[PDB]
Amino acid sequence: MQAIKCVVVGDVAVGKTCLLISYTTNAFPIPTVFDNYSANVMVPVNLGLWDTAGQEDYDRLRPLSYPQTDVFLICFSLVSPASYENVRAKWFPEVRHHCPSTPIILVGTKLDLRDDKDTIEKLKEKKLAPITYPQGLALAKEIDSVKYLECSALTQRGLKTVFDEAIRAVL
Numbered sequence: 355m356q357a358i359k360c361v362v363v364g365d366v367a368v369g370k371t372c373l374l375i376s377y378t379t380n381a382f383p384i385p386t387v388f389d390n391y392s393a394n395v396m397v398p399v400n401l402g403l404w405d406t407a408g409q410e411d412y413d414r415l416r417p418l419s420y421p422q423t424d425v426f427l428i429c430f431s432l433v434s435p436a437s438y439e440n441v442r443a444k445w446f447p448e449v450r451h452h453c454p455s456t457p458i459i460l461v462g463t464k465l466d467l468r469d470d471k472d473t474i475e476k477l478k479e480k481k482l483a484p485i486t487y488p489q490g491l492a493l494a495k496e497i498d499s500v501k502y503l504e505c506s507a508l509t510q511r512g513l514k515t516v517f518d519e520a521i522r523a524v525l
């Protein structure tokens with residue numbers, strides 16, 4: 355019955371499309387066309403999932419999707435400190451400029467990779483380490499997110515929670 359709009363933003367390759375597709379179809383992919391999806395879920399809610407292009411080239415046009423958004427998911431890769439930094443450097447500021455009062459959920463992605471051997475190896479070779487939970491929770495508090503939630507589109511762990519809370523942030 356109730357219609358809720360949800361826009362997903364964040365650095366390219368943090369897993370925004372896989373996130374939305376894995377949730378809407380319960381399967382893990384990748385479509386190149388930036389699209390919007392939908393889902394009927396009980397929290398009666400018709401959730402509209404709007405994907406975005408995080409590249410800089412679309413900095414000016416991206417925000418055209420923002421108007422009338424009910425809730426935002428600002429995502430960052432749990433195995434990418436760079437995407438973590440850009441949350442406060444770019445995404446939180448951008449969302450707030452266009453939509454000052456709209457609720458925000460901070461989403462950590464690729465949780466399945468935080469414990470991955472070869473992955474930790476890679477980050478280590480660059481003097482970097484995966485974003486621990488406390489760290490993610492800290493950032494959420496900084497930007498005053500309604501909630502901080504970690505998920506994995508590959509295993510779908512915590513996935514259902516992310517969108518349930520994104521909905522409860524509206525109802």
Ligand SMILES: Nc1nc2c(ncn2[C@@H]2O[C@H](COP(=O)(O)OP(=O)(O)OP(=O)(O)O)[C@@H](O)[C@H]2O)c(=O)[nH]1
Binds near residue numbers: 507
């Ligand atoms: N291991 C693992 N890899 C993931 C997961 N989610 C996404 N990926 C990988 O991350 C890469 C980024 O995929 P996208 O979903 O397109 O990320 P995105 O750039 O933020 O979203 P779009 O630009 O809209 O496509 C893909 O090659 C996936 O294989 C995950 O949960 N676990």
